[PDB]
Amino acid sequence: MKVIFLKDVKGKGKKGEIKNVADGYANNFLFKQGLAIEATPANLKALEAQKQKEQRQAAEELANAKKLKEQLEKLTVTIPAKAGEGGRLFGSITSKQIAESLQAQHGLKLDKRKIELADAIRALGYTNVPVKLHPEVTATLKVHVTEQK
Amino acid sequence: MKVIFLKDVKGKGKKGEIKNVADGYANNFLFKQGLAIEATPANLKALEAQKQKEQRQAAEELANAKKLKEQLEKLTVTIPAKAGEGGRLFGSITSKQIAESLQAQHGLKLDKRKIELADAIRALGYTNVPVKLHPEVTATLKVHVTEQK
């Protein structure tokens, strides 16, 4: 009996792992723990549709990360800050500030989790910060810390 | 008369811009300044071959930048340095040092031009530096500056 696996596969085979399972056992265990479903020509086409949309989405996303990477690499975030000791800052500029100045000045709302800053910026000057927009899309954000007051 | 443009097009149409130019004029001016060539069925197939190889290459490159991006994001460059003044360095760690420590410790020979460091690192700690491996492939290099002596 052909079956559409809903869960127990390589994690969640819900994508559409269609395998011919033993009838009965299928409807006695798999079908019992919601693991699989009847490979009816409806729930087969209906599966195809979901896989087709998941594939479209994944592609929109990638395409978006790519356009977004282009917007970012033309910018320059400007974060002014109180410094003294040879350019050295009083506090530290971190991912939230950078994320905020980016929204405020460039109209971009980016999750601070994507701003791959390691150690918090603690000095006046320019810093190129990497931004992980997607598994295979990283952009360089130029950050500029200027002395205020 | 069909002609294979060798130069004067959008920069260098040498890719294979095959256009039907007026016979005579072609062989009197274009053919004269090496701009175009006879669209013979040999120099047409021979063009196809070059376009086909240029397309293969461009793809190898991209594929390589992508694998290379994976190798880099697993590393951690360790550059020790003389510091004093509250972690502050005596000199500055720049792209050449980073490039060198990368070769020396990880067996990777990368052009320092790809290490998108802005202002030279002048303090002990960790710094994520962007690396432009290709027009659309950037990786994050984690750099670790440790106090020596």
CATH 3.40.50.1000 holds for B60-149? no
Q: Say if CB A148 and CB A80 are below 8 A apart.
A: yes
* Interface contact flag, A119 B126, Cβ < 8 Å: yes
CATH 1.10.150.530 holds for B1-59? no
Distance CA A101, CA A108 (A): 9
Q: Which residues in chain A are classed under CATH 3.40.5.10?
A: 1-59
Q: How many CA atoms lie within 13 A of A124 on its CB side?
A: 13
- Nearest CA distance, B11 vs chain A (angstrom): 24
- Name chain A contacts of B122, Cβ cutoff 8 Å: 123
Which of A77, A128, A146 to mutate: most B Cβ within 10 Å?
A128
- Name chain B contacts of A140, Cβ cutoff 8 Å: 116, 130, 132, 138
Question: Which residues of chain A are at the B interface, by a Cβ-Cβ cutoff of 8 Å?
Answer: 66, 69, 86, 88, 116-119, 122-123, 125-130, 132, 136, 138-140, 142
Cα–Cα distance list, B15 to A66, B11, B36 (Å):
26, 10, 12
> How many A×B Cβ pairs under 8 Å?
50
Distance CA A90, CA A96 (A): 17
Indicate the burial class of A56 (C-beta count within 10 angstroms; 0-12, 13-18, 19 or more): exposed
Sequence-distant (≥ 6) Cβ neighbours of residue B103 within 8 angstroms: B109, B110
Distance CA B85, CA A59 (A): 50
- Nearest CA distance, A8 vs chain B (angstrom): 30
Residue by residue, DSSP assigns A99-144 as HHHHHHHH-----GGGB---SPEEESEEEEEEEEEETTEEEEEEEE
Q: Say if CB A94 and CB A120 are below 8 A apart.
A: yes
Indicate the burial class of B12 (C-beta count within 10 angstroms; 0-12, 13-18, 19 or more): exposed
Angular region, B111: left φ>0, alpha ψ -120 to 50, beta rest: beta
Q: Which residues in chain A are classed under CATH 3.10.430.100?
A: 60-149
Distance CA A137, CA A65 (A): 6
